[PDB]
């Protein structure tokens, strides 16, 4: 029996097979020593005992507004944001570590960008049980697990007021770096780029980009419909878009991410960002009449990347966190720190971001209430209502609570089922192992995981042992913070991936973070003062209610 | 007239075109302010005035052996090595900056690995003269310039005692990251990897690697000849090798770098490293009987990458430098510093590494003296003499002095001619601009460049102005240090690229630099104690005289 199946090495120690049946843990730089890296060094011990729980820190951050208001207007704001940035980031390996093919560092894992990386090695194929040495010989049926604990019965809105404007932003944004390859299989991605490169606007490959570009004034091709600007058609921009068989090219919109024609919300954002790109080109040309099409295009792209990182940290994440602390996007906060400006999307981060519970039972646009069947492959809704109308509608409709269980609409429950199946193919280690990998104590029972007893009893009967609970299921079934959109694990595990992805970008490095990179002071300020409201309203005829929070 | 043609921005300030005819310099973080970034800050001025010249520091490093010996045995050795590593490295942009297509930062320049990067932007195409605003309307004829100042008349040996064992190591080693693509043109490379990835041994692409691997015990395919181990034939390892038409596959060796069959010296190293890879596999399997072929292969590769870095720093660079300071390869020296573990080969670095003057008039192997025509595409010499014999021969024959001028054998003078032509296509800025970009004062005349009067007068008559002198020519014609192999520019410009290349490797990062990465303490020590002598002798029947220095 493979000793590493027991996950003997603690605190990021590395389990290596030695001889026919022995194992050793490489505790290098873990802060611990001993056979299993559990004997702490004096400094390590002080840090671990003097640190408040994720639950207590969360409390401090969502209480005492009056105090935080004072803090948010001083340098303490910076000090804390930097603290948040470094502490969350150090939890992500960089250079990247393993991939679906190698549960060990290798030159292939480091140079081969078609692979998603992974934080914890896989469950060795030769282990007694699917999860290691705990649980039953066979995992609970994915389908059953989903219907029992993930299916929505009664719509549960997000207590934090998150809306569909946010939901679709999330779907739009994440899909620029989550593009699992159907051809290569699980564990592989076509979103080389691995981060905020805006590939969902410009395309994940040159040829597509060239087909999407006007090659005049650095602009992106487009078309006018009802006196409004929209992405061009595939006929004008011959690029592969995944539309239902039968829909003509002249009726398809070409945008960068092949999958965006399958939801008005997605194309909505495609339209907004496309309008913002061409707008920025105008501002740039005014500043540099001697610039060619290429430089105008390249420079505008860097600007939008900046705007995206800005808005994601200061509004998107802010919304999700519900923190009284005013999050801040300022690369300089890291100029005095040891930080690698690179990123590699992890398969776990992909699993974790499946926030389908956000989707509602139906989609309300003014007096009209559209169903999934009327909404999903709708090729006219966006143009019928226009950008302003849809933004207003999505900004008003509440999105569903992510954590807590039983809140995924039956229309898309199938995604969760496949997420669970893919997880087993990827052989993700147990939820508890990830709890530990991210600084939390493992759950000692299902009743501790869920703040209740009914689901816990059934889960325990199915899994047999809390140490067998799988990654994704653990994330969605964990008990949620007070009036939060999800549990602590979602944050403690997601923040590192997210923040490392945002700041790990090259435009955030000392070499790139300069006015000249963005065409000058005008371009640099577009990044620095970017805003959701401005992203929309500076590109629409009228300004509707725009926010990631319900009115 | 494009104002940036004057190279107005100093100290790494960035020239940006504004309005119809204005320009601005982005002095962000340069240590200077002002229209041209020429007004120094207090600390900046202190550093530039309190810093000794490259010539004085070089003096200190090559005198007082007794003092140095004392220092080398103390922590001062680590202190100076860290200084050297950090000061030389900070001179290289990271993330990478421009490429042949973009004289400005862009997402395309950052993500597109098929491009060599460049430290200084190109000479704007719309400038008055080919070099900017100085020199004649037409540059000196490349052919003529080479015959007049680069052609060898009388063989000039390297006063530092460098041998052919070193010369071939350099060619072998560098050809893993300098692989200009004929199909795409100058400015493009096939050596994705941009560094010490050992692609010249394992191939620059997966398919090729696969054809080269045995897929057993993690070993590399091979063949036996005279009881000795050699690389396999193209027949057993069907991989593309550039051999002259007319030679049969059965006499073509397959090695990783398509060009290595064109010199016994190159294949010699191919053989040595191949034997070392398979040897390491043995040691590894002894340690991990449960490991599969893949892990054995991946782990051995990481080990050889380490051995390569170790030897290049402590023996290779040591020999070139001539320093009494004992250089050291220890990744930990940088763990407390702000350093990016990434690298991108620069086109200027490619130009600079054209050390053809190293090649002799003929190749002596014992009593036999072989001509270029008997040496260049010889497919039997390596096997006829065996590894030991050739190593001994190359270790005894002195290589030619690199700097000084008039020392490139007529057989390969054509390379230099093409290097100069490619330079103009790449539109490399003038030598003086690079002097400045690397911390030196520009030469005020050709007489200052060359420590003499004749060549200088002829060069001045051809170029018209010292500010028109080109990159490569400047490097080879600059006056050499006392009894050195080349001038200061070669070191002051090359050291930064070289060390950044070496330490910027991901195996030198905190995440990778651990015993487990190399299979354990045994593998880790192979890296830490790697040696040229051991690389050869631990893989040959007998141990010949092996060194980068003539006996
Ligand atoms: C009702 C609206 C939505 C529909 C119809 C939908 C549909 C899908 C489908 C069909 C897949 C691929 C499923 C498979 O291969 O089995 C998928 C993947 C995914 N969805 Fe959704 N989704 C919706 C909303 C969202 C939202 C709001 C988010 C939150 C950001 C989200 C995040 C993801 C992620 C992260 C993936 C995996 C991406 C990848 O690996 O390529 N989805 N979704
Ligand atoms: C007599 C032995 C040698 C021969 C016959 C030779 C031949 C060549 C040839 C034919 C090219 C390509 C020329 C072109 O495209 O116009 C080349 C490139 C080059 N050689 Fe050599 N060379 C020799 C020795 C060396 C040595 C000792 C070094 C020092 C490390 C060296 C470094 C280079 C470099 C850096 C390049 C450019 C690589 C690239 O861009 O792909 N060569 N050599
Ligand atoms: C000043 C020293 C304080 C030591 C208190 C550290 C407490 C943790 O102690 C460690 O717990 C591990 C299990 O969790 C054991 O495996 C280790 O052997 C034990 O040393
Ligand atoms: C007063 C509030 C200060 C907030 C700054 C601390 C930054 C949060 O830091 C995070 O805290 C988690 C525990 O909640 C840990 O599990 C994470 O690893 C750590 O990065
Ligand atoms: C006593 C000698 C100590 C030498 C260690 C200093 C490290 C060398 O450092 C280098 O010096 C050059 C000038 O010589 C500069 O042009 C380079 O930019 C700098 O990195
Ligand atoms: C490496 C190994 O086999 N060690 C075992 C451990 O796995 C087991 O859990 C324990 C009993 O509690 O006894 C010991
Ligand atoms: C002192 C200590 O921690 N040793 C443990 C041992 O008790 C345990 O059986 C084994 C497997 O988990 O790992 C190691
Ligand atoms: C999943 C995948 O793409 N793997 C491929 C494999 O199918 C192919 O046989 C091999 C040779 O090129 O390269 C790799
Ligand atoms: C993989 C990739 O995108 N590489 C591109 C290549 O396709 C293109 O031909 C070249 C010229 O722009 O630049 C680089
Ligand atoms: C096929 C489909 O459902 N598309 C709908 C259409 O029926 C509806 O009338 C319109 C708004 O009026 O929005 C879109
Ligand atoms: C930007 C510009 O045109 N400024 C010019 C400069 O180029 C020129 O060298 C100088 C005369 O010495 O006068 C001024
Ligand atoms: C005070 C100063 O340095 N200004 C210089 C100016 O004199 C020069 O003409 C121009 C072009 O080099 O660059 C700027
Ligand atoms: C030098 C090079 O490879 N550039 C290519 C170009 O020739 C081609 O037309 C384009 C479309 O794919 O992509 C890029
Ligand atoms: C460009 C590259 O090398 N990517 C490789 C791909 O070719 C291979 O099929 C796959 C499976 O190993 O891994 C990755
Ligand atoms: C074609 C050629 O020149 N190859 C030479 C051969 O002539 C020489 O006799 C041999 C050593 O004896 O080394 C090889
Ligand atoms: C879940 C994740 C994708 C979003 C997220 C939420 C909160 C935070 C804050 C700054 C933190 O570090 O606690 C970061 C990122
Ligand atoms: C020219 C270059 C390719 C080799 C080289 C020579 C000397 C040094 C020393 C440590 C230095 O920094 O002066 C580094 C690299």
JSON list of N, CA, C and O in Angstrom, two decimals, chain A residues 17 19 26 29 96 102 287-288 294 335-342 509-510 512-513 516, chain B residues 17 19 26 29 95-96 102 287-288 294 335-342 510 512-513 516:
[
{"chain": "A", "resi": 17, "resn": "UNK", "atom": "N", "xyz": [8.11, 8.73, -2.71]},
{"chain": "A", "resi": 17, "resn": "UNK", "atom": "CA", "xyz": [8.27, 7.30, -2.56]},
{"chain": "A", "resi": 17, "resn": "UNK", "atom": "C", "xyz": [9.76, 6.98, -2.57]},
{"chain": "A", "resi": 17, "resn": "UNK", "atom": "O", "xyz": [10.50, 7.49, -3.41]},
{"chain": "A", "resi": 19, "resn": "UNK", "atom": "N", "xyz": [12.63, 3.59, -1.97]},
{"chain": "A", "resi": 19, "resn": "UNK", "atom": "CA", "xyz": [12.75, 2.16, -1.81]},
{"chain": "A", "resi": 19, "resn": "UNK", "atom": "C", "xyz": [11.44, 1.52, -2.21]},
{"chain": "A", "resi": 19, "resn": "UNK", "atom": "O", "xyz": [10.56, 2.17, -2.77]},
{"chain": "A", "resi": 26, "resn": "UNK", "atom": "N", "xyz": [9.75, 16.07, 2.21]},
{"chain": "A", "resi": 26, "resn": "UNK", "atom": "CA", "xyz": [10.72, 17.14, 2.03]},
{"chain": "A", "resi": 26, "resn": "UNK", "atom": "C", "xyz": [10.09, 18.35, 2.70]},
{"chain": "A", "resi": 26, "resn": "UNK", "atom": "O", "xyz": [9.20, 18.97, 2.13]},
{"chain": "A", "resi": 29, "resn": "UNK", "atom": "N", "xyz": [11.74, 24.62, 3.82]},
{"chain": "A", "resi": 29, "resn": "UNK", "atom": "CA", "xyz": [11.04, 25.90, 3.89]},
{"chain": "A", "resi": 29, "resn": "UNK", "atom": "C", "xyz": [9.57, 25.86, 4.28]},
{"chain": "A", "resi": 29, "resn": "UNK", "atom": "O", "xyz": [8.84, 26.80, 3.97]},
{"chain": "A", "resi": 96, "resn": "UNK", "atom": "N", "xyz": [4.71, 27.56, -11.32]},
{"chain": "A", "resi": 96, "resn": "UNK", "atom": "CA", "xyz": [3.68, 26.54, -11.12]},
{"chain": "A", "resi": 96, "resn": "UNK", "atom": "C", "xyz": [4.31, 25.19, -10.78]},
{"chain": "A", "resi": 96, "resn": "UNK", "atom": "O", "xyz": [5.49, 24.94, -11.07]},
{"chain": "A", "resi": 102, "resn": "UNK", "atom": "N", "xyz": [1.72, 15.03, -14.31]},
{"chain": "A", "resi": 102, "resn": "UNK", "atom": "CA", "xyz": [2.86, 14.93, -13.38]},
{"chain": "A", "resi": 102, "resn": "UNK", "atom": "C", "xyz": [2.56, 15.37, -11.96]},
{"chain": "A", "resi": 102, "resn": "UNK", "atom": "O", "xyz": [2.30, 16.55, -11.71]},
{"chain": "A", "resi": 287, "resn": "UNK", "atom": "N", "xyz": [-4.22, 61.69, -29.08]},
{"chain": "A", "resi": 287, "resn": "UNK", "atom": "CA", "xyz": [-2.96, 61.92, -28.40]},
{"chain": "A", "resi": 287, "resn": "UNK", "atom": "C", "xyz": [-1.74, 61.63, -29.29]},
{"chain": "A", "resi": 287, "resn": "UNK", "atom": "O", "xyz": [-0.73, 62.34, -29.23]},
{"chain": "A", "resi": 288, "resn": "UNK", "atom": "N", "xyz": [-1.84, 60.59, -30.12]},
{"chain": "A", "resi": 288, "resn": "UNK", "atom": "CA", "xyz": [-0.73, 60.22, -30.98]},
{"chain": "A", "resi": 288, "resn": "UNK", "atom": "C", "xyz": [-1.12, 60.08, -32.44]},
{"chain": "A", "resi": 288, "resn": "UNK", "atom": "O", "xyz": [-1.30, 58.97, -32.95]},
{"chain": "A", "resi": 294, "resn": "UNK", "atom": "N", "xyz": [-1.43, 49.03, -35.47]},
{"chain": "A", "resi": 294, "resn": "UNK", "atom": "CA", "xyz": [-0.93, 48.07, -34.49]},
{"chain": "A", "resi": 294, "resn": "UNK", "atom": "C", "xyz": [-0.72, 48.66, -33.09]},
{"chain": "A", "resi": 294, "resn": "UNK", "atom": "O", "xyz": [-1.25, 48.13, -32.11]},
{"chain": "A", "resi": 335, "resn": "UNK", "atom": "N", "xyz": [5.67, 46.64, -5.00]},
{"chain": "A", "resi": 335, "resn": "UNK", "atom": "CA", "xyz": [7.01, 46.93, -5.48]},
{"chain": "A", "resi": 335, "resn": "UNK", "atom": "C", "xyz": [8.12, 46.66, -4.48]},
{"chain": "A", "resi": 335, "resn": "UNK", "atom": "O", "xyz": [9.28, 46.46, -4.87]},
{"chain": "A", "resi": 336, "resn": "UNK", "atom": "N", "xyz": [7.79, 46.63, -3.19]},
{"chain": "A", "resi": 336, "resn": "UNK", "atom": "CA", "xyz": [8.81, 46.37, -2.19]},
{"chain": "A", "resi": 336, "resn": "UNK", "atom": "C", "xyz": [8.77, 44.93, -1.69]},
{"chain": "A", "resi": 336, "resn": "UNK", "atom": "O", "xyz": [9.46, 44.58, -0.73]},
{"chain": "A", "resi": 337, "resn": "UNK", "atom": "N", "xyz": [7.98, 44.09, -2.35]},
{"chain": "A", "resi": 337, "resn": "UNK", "atom": "CA", "xyz": [7.84, 42.70, -1.95]},
{"chain": "A", "resi": 337, "resn": "UNK", "atom": "C", "xyz": [8.42, 41.70, -2.95]},
{"chain": "A", "resi": 337, "resn": "UNK", "atom": "O", "xyz": [8.70, 42.04, -4.09]},
{"chain": "A", "resi": 338, "resn": "UNK", "atom": "N", "xyz": [8.60, 40.46, -2.49]},
{"chain": "A", "resi": 338, "resn": "UNK", "atom": "CA", "xyz": [9.09, 39.38, -3.33]},
{"chain": "A", "resi": 338, "resn": "UNK", "atom": "C", "xyz": [7.85, 38.75, -3.94]},
{"chain": "A", "resi": 338, "resn": "UNK", "atom": "O", "xyz": [7.11, 38.03, -3.27]},
{"chain": "A", "resi": 339, "resn": "UNK", "atom": "N", "xyz": [7.62, 39.01, -5.22]},
{"chain": "A", "resi": 339, "resn": "UNK", "atom": "CA", "xyz": [6.42, 38.53, -5.90]},
{"chain": "A", "resi": 339, "resn": "UNK", "atom": "C", "xyz": [6.72, 38.19, -7.35]},
{"chain": "A", "resi": 339, "resn": "UNK", "atom": "O", "xyz": [7.37, 38.96, -8.05]},
{"chain": "A", "resi": 340, "resn": "UNK", "atom": "N", "xyz": [6.24, 37.05, -7.82]},
{"chain": "A", "resi": 340, "resn": "UNK", "atom": "CA", "xyz": [6.48, 36.65, -9.21]},
{"chain": "A", "resi": 340, "resn": "UNK", "atom": "C", "xyz": [5.34, 37.12, -10.09]},
{"chain": "A", "resi": 340, "resn": "UNK", "atom": "O", "xyz": [4.19, 36.75, -9.87]},
{"chain": "A", "resi": 341, "resn": "UNK", "atom": "N", "xyz": [5.64, 37.92, -11.11]},
{"chain": "A", "resi": 341, "resn": "UNK", "atom": "CA", "xyz": [4.60, 38.40, -12.00]},
{"chain": "A", "resi": 341, "resn": "UNK", "atom": "C", "xyz": [4.21, 37.42, -13.09]},
{"chain": "A", "resi": 341, "resn": "UNK", "atom": "O", "xyz": [4.29, 37.72, -14.27]},
{"chain": "A", "resi": 342, "resn": "UNK", "atom": "N", "xyz": [3.78, 36.22, -12.68]},
{"chain": "A", "resi": 342, "resn": "UNK", "atom": "CA", "xyz": [3.33, 35.19, -13.61]},
{"chain": "A", "resi": 342, "resn": "UNK", "atom": "C", "xyz": [2.15, 34.46, -12.96]},
{"chain": "A", "resi": 342, "resn": "UNK", "atom": "O", "xyz": [1.93, 34.57, -11.76]},
{"chain": "A", "resi": 509, "resn": "UNK", "atom": "N", "xyz": [3.74, 44.73, -13.10]},
{"chain": "A", "resi": 509, "resn": "UNK", "atom": "CA", "xyz": [5.15, 44.70, -12.72]},
{"chain": "A", "resi": 509, "resn": "UNK", "atom": "C", "xyz": [5.80, 46.07, -12.85]},
{"chain": "A", "resi": 509, "resn": "UNK", "atom": "O", "xyz": [5.34, 46.94, -13.59]},
{"chain": "A", "resi": 510, "resn": "UNK", "atom": "N", "xyz": [6.88, 46.30, -12.09]},
{"chain": "A", "resi": 510, "resn": "UNK", "atom": "CA", "xyz": [7.57, 47.59, -12.14]},
{"chain": "A", "resi": 510, "resn": "UNK", "atom": "C", "xyz": [7.94, 47.97, -13.58]},
{"chain": "A", "resi": 510, "resn": "UNK", "atom": "O", "xyz": [7.90, 49.15, -13.96]},
{"chain": "A", "resi": 512, "resn": "UNK", "atom": "N", "xyz": [6.31, 47.25, -16.42]},
{"chain": "A", "resi": 512, "resn": "UNK", "atom": "CA", "xyz": [5.17, 47.66, -17.23]},
{"chain": "A", "resi": 512, "resn": "UNK", "atom": "C", "xyz": [4.32, 48.78, -16.66]},
{"chain": "A", "resi": 512, "resn": "UNK", "atom": "O", "xyz": [3.76, 49.59, -17.42]},
{"chain": "A", "resi": 513, "resn": "UNK", "atom": "N", "xyz": [4.19, 48.83, -15.34]},
{"chain": "A", "resi": 513, "resn": "UNK", "atom": "CA", "xyz": [3.36, 49.83, -14.70]},
{"chain": "A", "resi": 513, "resn": "UNK", "atom": "C", "xyz": [3.92, 51.25, -14.79]},
{"chain": "A", "resi": 513, "resn": "UNK", "atom": "O", "xyz": [4.43, 51.80, -13.81]},
{"chain": "A", "resi": 516, "resn": "UNK", "atom": "N", "xyz": [3.90, 55.46, -20.00]},
{"chain": "A", "resi": 516, "resn": "UNK", "atom": "CA", "xyz": [4.20, 55.18, -21.40]},
{"chain": "A", "resi": 516, "resn": "UNK", "atom": "C", "xyz": [3.60, 53.86, -21.89]},
{"chain": "A", "resi": 516, "resn": "UNK", "atom": "O", "xyz": [3.21, 53.76, -23.05]},
{"chain": "B", "resi": 17, "resn": "UNK", "atom": "N", "xyz": [6.27, 59.40, -29.01]},
{"chain": "B", "resi": 17, "resn": "UNK", "atom": "CA", "xyz": [5.83, 60.41, -29.96]},
{"chain": "B", "resi": 17, "resn": "UNK", "atom": "C", "xyz": [4.51, 60.99, -29.47]},
{"chain": "B", "resi": 17, "resn": "UNK", "atom": "O", "xyz": [3.61, 60.25, -29.08]},
{"chain": "B", "resi": 19, "resn": "UNK", "atom": "N", "xyz": [1.55, 64.23, -30.33]},
{"chain": "B", "resi": 19, "resn": "UNK", "atom": "CA", "xyz": [1.15, 65.25, -31.29]},
{"chain": "B", "resi": 19, "resn": "UNK", "atom": "C", "xyz": [1.86, 64.98, -32.61]},
{"chain": "B", "resi": 19, "resn": "UNK", "atom": "O", "xyz": [2.48, 63.93, -32.77]},
{"chain": "B", "resi": 26, "resn": "UNK", "atom": "N", "xyz": [9.35, 59.16, -20.60]},
{"chain": "B", "resi": 26, "resn": "UNK", "atom": "CA", "xyz": [8.74, 58.65, -19.37]},
{"chain": "B", "resi": 26, "resn": "UNK", "atom": "C", "xyz": [9.92, 58.25, -18.49]},
{"chain": "B", "resi": 26, "resn": "UNK", "atom": "O", "xyz": [10.53, 57.21, -18.71]},
{"chain": "B", "resi": 29, "resn": "UNK", "atom": "N", "xyz": [10.79, 55.80, -12.44]},
{"chain": "B", "resi": 29, "resn": "UNK", "atom": "CA", "xyz": [11.74, 54.89, -11.81]},
{"chain": "B", "resi": 29, "resn": "UNK", "atom": "C", "xyz": [13.13, 54.81, -12.41]},
{"chain": "B", "resi": 29, "resn": "UNK", "atom": "O", "xyz": [13.82, 53.82, -12.20]},
{"chain": "B", "resi": 95, "resn": "UNK", "atom": "N", "xyz": [9.24, 41.43, -16.51]},
{"chain": "B", "resi": 95, "resn": "UNK", "atom": "CA", "xyz": [8.88, 40.89, -17.83]},
{"chain": "B", "resi": 95, "resn": "UNK", "atom": "C", "xyz": [9.60, 41.51, -19.02]},
{"chain": "B", "resi": 95, "resn": "UNK", "atom": "O", "xyz": [10.00, 42.67, -18.98]},
{"chain": "B", "resi": 96, "resn": "UNK", "atom": "N", "xyz": [9.77, 40.73, -20.11]},
{"chain": "B", "resi": 96, "resn": "UNK", "atom": "CA", "xyz": [10.44, 41.22, -21.31]},
{"chain": "B", "resi": 96, "resn": "UNK", "atom": "C", "xyz": [9.72, 42.44, -21.88]},
{"chain": "B", "resi": 96, "resn": "UNK", "atom": "O", "xyz": [8.55, 42.67, -21.62]},
{"chain": "B", "resi": 102, "resn": "UNK", "atom": "N", "xyz": [7.39, 45.17, -32.34]},
{"chain": "B", "resi": 102, "resn": "UNK", "atom": "CA", "xyz": [6.89, 46.22, -31.47]},
{"chain": "B", "resi": 102, "resn": "UNK", "atom": "C", "xyz": [7.96, 46.95, -30.68]},
{"chain": "B", "resi": 102, "resn": "UNK", "atom": "O", "xyz": [8.61, 46.37, -29.80]},
{"chain": "B", "resi": 287, "resn": "UNK", "atom": "N", "xyz": [17.30, 4.53, -6.22]},
{"chain": "B", "resi": 287, "resn": "UNK", "atom": "CA", "xyz": [16.67, 5.25, -5.13]},
{"chain": "B", "resi": 287, "resn": "UNK", "atom": "C", "xyz": [15.15, 5.07, -5.10]},
{"chain": "B", "resi": 287, "resn": "UNK", "atom": "O", "xyz": [14.55, 4.96, -4.04]},
{"chain": "B", "resi": 288, "resn": "UNK", "atom": "N", "xyz": [14.54, 5.03, -6.28]},
{"chain": "B", "resi": 288, "resn": "UNK", "atom": "CA", "xyz": [13.08, 4.91, -6.37]},
{"chain": "B", "resi": 288, "resn": "UNK", "atom": "C", "xyz": [12.64, 3.78, -7.29]},
{"chain": "B", "resi": 288, "resn": "UNK", "atom": "O", "xyz": [12.23, 4.01, -8.44]},
{"chain": "B", "resi": 294, "resn": "UNK", "atom": "N", "xyz": [8.43, 8.01, -17.08]},
{"chain": "B", "resi": 294, "resn": "UNK", "atom": "CA", "xyz": [8.26, 9.45, -17.15]},
{"chain": "B", "resi": 294, "resn": "UNK", "atom": "C", "xyz": [8.94, 10.21, -16.01]},
{"chain": "B", "resi": 294, "resn": "UNK", "atom": "O", "xyz": [9.72, 11.13, -16.27]},
{"chain": "B", "resi": 335, "resn": "UNK", "atom": "N", "xyz": [17.22, 34.37, -2.55]},
{"chain": "B", "resi": 335, "resn": "UNK", "atom": "CA", "xyz": [15.96, 34.19, -1.85]},
{"chain": "B", "resi": 335, "resn": "UNK", "atom": "C", "xyz": [15.49, 35.41, -1.07]},
{"chain": "B", "resi": 335, "resn": "UNK", "atom": "O", "xyz": [14.30, 35.53, -0.77]},
{"chain": "B", "resi": 336, "resn": "UNK", "atom": "N", "xyz": [16.39, 36.31, -0.73]},
{"chain": "B", "resi": 336, "resn": "UNK", "atom": "CA", "xyz": [15.98, 37.49, 0.01]},
{"chain": "B", "resi": 336, "resn": "UNK", "atom": "C", "xyz": [15.88, 38.72, -0.87]},
{"chain": "B", "resi": 336, "resn": "UNK", "atom": "O", "xyz": [15.70, 39.84, -0.37]},
{"chain": "B", "resi": 337, "resn": "UNK", "atom": "N", "xyz": [15.96, 38.53, -2.19]},
{"chain": "B", "resi": 337, "resn": "UNK", "atom": "CA", "xyz": [15.90, 39.63, -3.14]},
{"chain": "B", "resi": 337, "resn": "UNK", "atom": "C", "xyz": [14.67, 39.62, -4.03]},
{"chain": "B", "resi": 337, "resn": "UNK", "atom": "O", "xyz": [13.97, 38.63, -4.12]},
{"chain": "B", "resi": 338, "resn": "UNK", "atom": "N", "xyz": [14.43, 40.75, -4.69]},
{"chain": "B", "resi": 338, "resn": "UNK", "atom": "CA", "xyz": [13.32, 40.89, -5.62]},
{"chain": "B", "resi": 338, "resn": "UNK", "atom": "C", "xyz": [13.88, 40.48, -6.98]},
{"chain": "B", "resi": 338, "resn": "UNK", "atom": "O", "xyz": [14.62, 41.23, -7.61]},
{"chain": "B", "resi": 339, "resn": "UNK", "atom": "N", "xyz": [13.51, 39.28, -7.42]},
{"chain": "B", "resi": 339, "resn": "UNK", "atom": "CA", "xyz": [14.04, 38.74, -8.66]},
{"chain": "B", "resi": 339, "resn": "UNK", "atom": "C", "xyz": [12.98, 37.90, -9.38]},
{"chain": "B", "resi": 339, "resn": "UNK", "atom": "O", "xyz": [12.33, 37.06, -8.75]},
{"chain": "B", "resi": 340, "resn": "UNK", "atom": "N", "xyz": [12.79, 38.13, -10.68]},
{"chain": "B", "resi": 340, "resn": "UNK", "atom": "CA", "xyz": [11.82, 37.37, -11.46]},
{"chain": "B", "resi": 340, "resn": "UNK", "atom": "C", "xyz": [12.47, 36.12, -12.05]},
{"chain": "B", "resi": 340, "resn": "UNK", "atom": "O", "xyz": [13.47, 36.21, -12.75]},
{"chain": "B", "resi": 341, "resn": "UNK", "atom": "N", "xyz": [11.90, 34.96, -11.76]},
{"chain": "B", "resi": 341, "resn": "UNK", "atom": "CA", "xyz": [12.46, 33.74, -12.29]},
{"chain": "B", "resi": 341, "resn": "UNK", "atom": "C", "xyz": [11.92, 33.43, -13.68]},
{"chain": "B", "resi": 341, "resn": "UNK", "atom": "O", "xyz": [11.21, 32.44, -13.88]},
{"chain": "B", "resi": 342, "resn": "UNK", "atom": "N", "xyz": [12.23, 34.30, -14.63]},
{"chain": "B", "resi": 342, "resn": "UNK", "atom": "CA", "xyz": [11.82, 34.10, -16.01]},
{"chain": "B", "resi": 342, "resn": "UNK", "atom": "C", "xyz": [12.90, 34.71, -16.89]},
{"chain": "B", "resi": 342, "resn": "UNK", "atom": "O", "xyz": [13.71, 35.50, -16.42]},
{"chain": "B", "resi": 510, "resn": "UNK", "atom": "N", "xyz": [12.62, 29.54, -5.18]},
{"chain": "B", "resi": 510, "resn": "UNK", "atom": "CA", "xyz": [12.34, 28.91, -3.88]},
{"chain": "B", "resi": 510, "resn": "UNK", "atom": "C", "xyz": [11.42, 27.69, -4.00]},
{"chain": "B", "resi": 510, "resn": "UNK", "atom": "O", "xyz": [11.57, 26.71, -3.29]},
{"chain": "B", "resi": 512, "resn": "UNK", "atom": "N", "xyz": [11.14, 25.54, -6.55]},
{"chain": "B", "resi": 512, "resn": "UNK", "atom": "CA", "xyz": [11.78, 24.38, -7.16]},
{"chain": "B", "resi": 512, "resn": "UNK", "atom": "C", "xyz": [13.06, 23.91, -6.50]},
{"chain": "B", "resi": 512, "resn": "UNK", "atom": "O", "xyz": [13.35, 22.71, -6.50]},
{"chain": "B", "resi": 513, "resn": "UNK", "atom": "N", "xyz": [13.84, 24.84, -5.97]},
{"chain": "B", "resi": 513, "resn": "UNK", "atom": "CA", "xyz": [15.13, 24.51, -5.36]},
{"chain": "B", "resi": 513, "resn": "UNK", "atom": "C", "xyz": [14.99, 23.74, -4.05]},
{"chain": "B", "resi": 513, "resn": "UNK", "atom": "O", "xyz": [15.22, 24.28, -2.96]},
{"chain": "B", "resi": 516, "resn": "UNK", "atom": "N", "xyz": [13.52, 17.30, -3.07]},
{"chain": "B", "resi": 516, "resn": "UNK", "atom": "CA", "xyz": [12.50, 16.48, -3.70]},
{"chain": "B", "resi": 516, "resn": "UNK", "atom": "C", "xyz": [12.39, 16.72, -5.20]},
{"chain": "B", "resi": 516, "resn": "UNK", "atom": "O", "xyz": [12.11, 15.79, -5.97]}
]
